[PDB]
Structure formats: structure tokens, C-alpha cells
Amino acid sequence: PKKPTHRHKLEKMRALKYFKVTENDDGSYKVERTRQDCPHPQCGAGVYMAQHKDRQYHLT
RNA sequence: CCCAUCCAAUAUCGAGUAACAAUUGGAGGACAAGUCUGGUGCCAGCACCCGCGGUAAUUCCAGCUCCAAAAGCGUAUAUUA
RNA sequence: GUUCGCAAGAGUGAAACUUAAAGAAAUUGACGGAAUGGCACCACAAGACGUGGAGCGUGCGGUUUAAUUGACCAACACGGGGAACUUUACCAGAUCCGGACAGGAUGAGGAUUGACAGAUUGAGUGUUCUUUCUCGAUUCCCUGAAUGGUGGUGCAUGGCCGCUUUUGGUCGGUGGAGUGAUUUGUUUGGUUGAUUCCGUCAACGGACGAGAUCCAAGCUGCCCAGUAGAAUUCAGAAUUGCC
RNA sequence: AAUGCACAAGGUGAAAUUUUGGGCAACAGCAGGUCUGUGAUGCUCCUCAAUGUUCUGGGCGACACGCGCACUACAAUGUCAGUGAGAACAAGAAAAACGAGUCGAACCUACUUGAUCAAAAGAGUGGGGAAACCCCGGAAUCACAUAGACUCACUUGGGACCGAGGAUUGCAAUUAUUGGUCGCGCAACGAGGAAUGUCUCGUAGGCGCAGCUCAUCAAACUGUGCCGAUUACGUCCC
RNA sequence: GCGCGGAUAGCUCAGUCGGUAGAGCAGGGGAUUGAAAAUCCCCGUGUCCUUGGUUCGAUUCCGAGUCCGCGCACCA
RNA sequence: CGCGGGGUGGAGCAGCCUGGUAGCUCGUCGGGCUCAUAACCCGAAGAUCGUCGGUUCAAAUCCGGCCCCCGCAACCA
RNA sequence: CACCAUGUUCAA
Ligand SMILES: NC[C@@H]1O[C@H](O[C@H]2[C@@H](O)[C@H](O[C@@H]3[C@@H](O)[C@H](N)C[C@H](N)[C@H]3O[C@H]3O[C@H](CO)[C@@H](O)[C@H](O)[C@H]3N)O[C@@H]2CO)[C@H](N)[C@@H](O)[C@@H]1O
Ligand SMILES: [Mg+2]
Ligand SMILES: [Mg+2]
Ligand SMILES: [Mg+2]
Ligand SMILES: [Mg+2]
Ligand SMILES: [Mg+2]
Ligand SMILES: [Mg+2]
């Protein structure tokens, strides 16, 4: 009765996925991450999980 | 009036898209000249005669391009060959 | 209109209008409820075994249906068509691009690909809406196009098939005949399934088809076999009679 | 017959007149069929909610009816239940995949089993690349002094229709895929009107069997064998 | 003049004696054809004079009244 | 109106048992023959006997009342 | 010598 939309992928506006605080980086620390990977399924290296009500996400 | 003569005889206006612009009938045959493109689909129309047109029209309605005569060229009725 | 006639009629004799041929003689063909000679169990004869009647299978028509997707002797168990899905061409929906490549505007500060859970849905189908991560130039958005179609037209075609036709038929060359289309060769006679042969012959020389070649079956030679078979001779076993 | 080309009858022979049976077949043509065979094709239509292409579900198969073509019968020259003898053509498994450049499994099959108890199955174990295994290919008609049941009836003829278990093919069986079991059989049908088809000897007819379609399904078709006649060997009547 | 009678699609026309409408052609589209004609299917469709008395409602009943036909008349 | 005749399958007509899915010709259907149609051949269907009553075991017939159709007459001053 | 009638319009 009504035509569907034929979805295009949404732009994330200058961030696909993101890190943590204290961008000074005075030789003490690497920056922390904001999600996890749960590896070997399938890659786990740069695979970062979704929030989705803090649940999960690929796949892995 | 026209035509003719003239743009100095000391001394006369003027072409450019020379826009100051050719048309009238045709392109199957007789009969000179398109197996071009678009439209219509035995309709609309053409065709003196033969014939064209029934969804790929050498013939209709048009655009292009050609042919013929040309300040002319079609058509009709008489009339001679 | 007039002159003849007892009358039927006769003689004389137009036009308006209409039409693109009507005719004439020949040729080639097709056709005859026209002669003549042949042939064929897709003809009959003399017969066989059936179909048409019945029940079912299957194809065709019609009627239904959302839809029930060529052909009318030479269509109808045929399109190798005995389709549950697929096939598939039809109907109700749903995806995907398999719209290459160009040109123009977004574009890495992201063009875009894909998807878990829910809602949507016929669908534990991300198709889409919410959600956020992945993909990392492959794409996407416009414009121009192109490639796909078991879309149409077999009356635009190629190819193949069927059918004219199970018939013996067609064609040149050069000569003859006629203004010519066209004839002759290619024939009246016998003959064969056969323009097959013999003879005749204004024809003579050729080409194809027919025959030949090819396959299969029947008899047969050579070759041949621990992928075919046979006999024998010793051993082993079985019957062994009075019924 | 009258030269010739040849013909009939008989011989010879395995075979006697195209030996038999097929294949192949000229020239012209049909406005035959095929655009549903092709990456055969011109033109023209559709071309992103597409007439493309894929899913999902239907349909092609739906039945007052009319027709082609088969199949099964209407029975005693038979149906049944036994038992015997005994054919030919034929088919048969796999990929640059998944497994252990070599080998396996997909295909057909015998044999055992299932079996101190129905078929249909389901399982083992062999073999076969096919003249080598199936296979001494145990086809069905037929046969039988079978001292077998029926005895002329819509009947033990016929098996349409459909009811209930069950098991296999498939990813899926409902508008039963197919087999098997017990019911139903009171469904016509007793040899078929007008009409009509094919056929001249290993033929017609009967009989089955392979292959092909095929995961599952032959009343089909292409082949093959088996049993095996009636009539004509004529004519132009249609 | 009186009486008998008939009006329903663009036209033509059948009606259950007093419960609501039939076709067909003409029309618009398909199937068919080489295009047509025929042919078949599907579609637009008739407030029935005017109305009253109103059977649950007048087309179907009866009587009034446009329409258009038919039976029958000074007196010797 | 008097009087007289008839209503029968879609058409035209018959019908003497008081009675045959009532009969006839044509038509309508279904199949054949034909390339196709007609002719022709083989089949099958179709009747509120106009209607209501009554006689009867039984009615198209028999007796009626009605509705129609069709005439014969409808006289002499 | 029984009966044996007919096949729409253009076009190819
Ligand atoms: N290519 C052979 C052709 O045979 C034709 O002739 C054939 C016909 O005369 C005739 O054929 C007939 C046929 O007409 C008819 N319609 C059916 C008949 N069965 C045939 O018969 C022929 O074939 C069968 C083989 O099955 C045999 O019974 C018979 O011996 C044979 N004469 O027999 C000949 C076949 O041998 C023509 N001569 C010719 O078209 C051609 O040569
Ligand atoms: Mg044109
Ligand atoms: Mg022009
Ligand atoms: Mg059908
Ligand atoms: Mg010459
Ligand atoms: Mg009969
Ligand atoms: Mg006539």
C-alpha cells in the first residue's frame, strides 16, 4: 500500500567508532577503547562491538 | 511619366547574413530525380492512367536531401499535332 | 418520331448517363460427373484384427477460474509436453540489478557493502523502520545510454523439419521449329517398381534424380578366445530293479 | 513375346527376382511449423514497485459437455491356485566439489539376513566400468494324464469407485507421487448404430522385456524377442 | 360522435391477474485474421403517461386523463 | 349479441380402446459423411392437451361455467 | 446414363 525506502547506509558524522579520554598522551599510556572484540570468531583485531542497549554487535 | 544619361565638369548617395533572402510542381512506372528519417495503419489521404495505404508505405502527412522548368509554375475546359 | 402489319411484330434509329477494359488467336499450366493406358492395403476386392457403444489413462475443444501459460490428410500419448517445487512461459505477492561504460554534482573530514536483537512481514526475509557496528572505493545520486526477455511479429528472416511426393521425375549447351510466349531433345511401340531399358527418331552430346554406394538380417571362408564354448581320459559322488 | 529389351513356370540353392528390411533421395514450391532449442536473427515492445531475475504460495490436473488416441474388459478356446519348460535388444557410479598426484563414496546388482513367523521393507556382505558381475539373463503368451477348485451366472467374469492401517522417494505428498495389506465391488460392461483405421509372411494379432522421459511415477514412444495365422497374389469399382 | 383498445434502454418489444424489471441491436474494449467481414465473450443499461384509491410497495389492480388506432348513428 | 366452429411440443395440423414417454410433417439437439456448409444417414429430447369445476376405476374425448380466435346472420316500413 | 447444390472482401 506504501512504497518502502530502499535504505542507504547512514553516515556517522566524523566518527565510525571511538576511543577514550586524556588525549594529551605524555608518555604514560595508550588510549583506552570504548568497546570490545571477543576474538577468533572471526578476526577480532579491529572488530569493535556495537552498543545496542549495551549488548553486542562482523561477526565475529 | 518611362526609358537614356549621370554620381563632378571647381563641386554629387549607396550591398554584404550582398536580410536587397525564388518560387512552383515532383522523387514506384511513363517521366528526370531517395532501397533516408519521423507519423498514420485499406484510416486519413494520394493517384490524369497503372496503382499506393490492412503496424518495417520507393506513392499518404511531414523533416532532410535531390530532380525539372524558372520570374515564373501548377490546375480546369475548349482546340491542333 | 414516322412508315408498313389483322396482330405478333418489321424497317429506320438516338441521347443523357456509365466504364479501363470488353474482345481475338495462340502458349504453358491447373481442372473435367471427356476418352485411353497404367498404378497404390495411407484405395477397393477376398479377409483379418479392431476403433465408434462401456469403464478408465492421456491429448484437444468448451465451460469455469485470481490463473486454469503452439498446432485445427499434412492439429489432437504432438512440441520428445509422464510439469508436486524447479521446470514455468500463467496468477497473487516479495526481493535482487544481472542499468556495462561515459558525462555532472556528494566523496576518504567516508562513496558505500553487510548484519545481531525488536517492530514490519507469508518469512529466526535487515526488504524496510528503530538501533549501532562492520565493508573500505568495488559503490551510490542525477543524465545519457546500454543488456536481458519462454515479450510480440514464423506474414520480415536464417537453419532444421514436415508436406506437395512412395511419385519417376526435373535442367542446360549447341542444332532444328515458330513474330512470340514456347517447343524439340524428354516419343508414339513394347518393357520395368523406375524417361528402367530396347527400338524409332531433327536431333546430338551431357548433368542430376532412379539404379549404384551404406546399414541390418539370413548361408559361408580365413582369423580367434583363463571376457566364447566344447568334447574326452583317469579319479570322487548319485541311482541301480523284485517293484 | 517374336530382332531386341525382357516375362511366366520349374531347376539350382542358405537365399530367386529391387533377396528381405530400412537409410539416403533431384528440381521446383507451400506466404506449412518453429522468433518456446540455441550466445540463430532483423524490426518493435518492457526495461528498477521492470515483460529482466529470483524466492514464497498457487496453477498448468480445475468438470453440466463434445471429440482424437490408447488401456482394461464383457468370460469356459475362460478366471483361479499350482507345477514345468524357457528369449532377445539392452542399461549400469561424479565434477579445479567434500574426503582420505593416486584412491574412496553416488550407479546397477547377486547373496545372506530380517525370520522361534504377512507383504512392502530395512539391513549385512560380495561383485561389476559392463562378452568378464548380474547370467546357465528361470519374460509373458504357452504347456500339464494338475486324475486342482469354479459351471453359464453380471458369476470365483470385470476391477472402475473409496474406506482404514502401513512403508518407501523427496527440502516438501494436501488437489491420494508410488508400492504393498484387508475391505468395497449392488460401477458400467453380456461383443457394440451411422460410420471408421491398419495390414500380404516369421506378417496381422497376441505376448511380455529393455531403453528413453526418470530423486519418485508409463495405459507413452524407440527398440527387441516369443507364439503365430485368415485371405489375396487381383482390379480400377470407390 | 360515443365505445373497444396500446405507451418498458438510442429505437423496437415480452410480462407473476393485485411483491420491483428480460433480451436484442446500436455503442466502448478484447479473442480471431495478413488486415477485414462475419462469429464468440465482456461491458452502458429501461423513475414504465400523470397519478390517485395507495395490498407489506402500482410496472404488474381499478378508475380518472396526454398520446395513437379501431367498433358504430339524421328521416322516408 | 343471437347462433355456429375451435384452443393441442418451437411452427402447422391430426387424435375412433373414455387411456401407449399422448400422434404427423417441419424445427431444436447430439454424432456421422464432406476440406467446409446444405442435402443425406444414425440417434435422443421436447406437450400445464389455454384455463377452473364436474361424470368416471380411468377424461384431449364426457357435462359445465369462463378467456380468446374465426365467421353465419342481424329482417320488411 | 439413379442423386451429386455451393464455397464472404482485398491481398500474397
Ligand atoms: N525408393 C523406393 C521407391 O519405391 C516406390 O515404389 C514403391 C511402391 O510402388 C510400392 O510401395 C508400396 C506403397 O506404395 C504402399 N503405400 C504400401 C506398400 N506396402 C508398399 O509396398 C512396398 O513396401 C513394402 C515394404 O514394407 C513391401 O510390402 C512391398 O514388397 C513393397 N512393394 O513398392 C515400391 C517399394 O519397393 C517408387 N518406385 C519410387 O518412389 C521409389 O523407387
Ligand atoms: Mg516509411
Ligand atoms: Mg516525401
Ligand atoms: Mg483443457
Ligand atoms: Mg535454341
Ligand atoms: Mg447407439
Ligand atoms: Mg447461395
Distances (CA, A) of A21 to A8, A10, A18, A25, A31: 32, 26, 10, 10, 7
Coil, helix or strand at residue A24: coil
Q: How far is the CA of A6 from the centre of ligand 7 (A)?
A: 70
| Cα separation, A48 vs A56, whole angstroms | 9
Question: Maximum distance among all alpha carbons in chain A?
Answer: 62
Resolution of this deposited model, Å: 2.7
Q: How far is the CA of A59 from the centre of ligand 7 (A)?
A: 87
Annotate A25-60 with three-state secondary structure: CCCCCCCCECCCCCCCCCCCCCCCCCCCCCCCCCCC
Taking the CA of residue A24 and the C1' sugar atom of nucleotide F48, their distance in angstroms comes to 115
- Residue A35, Cβ neighbours under 10 Å: how many? 15
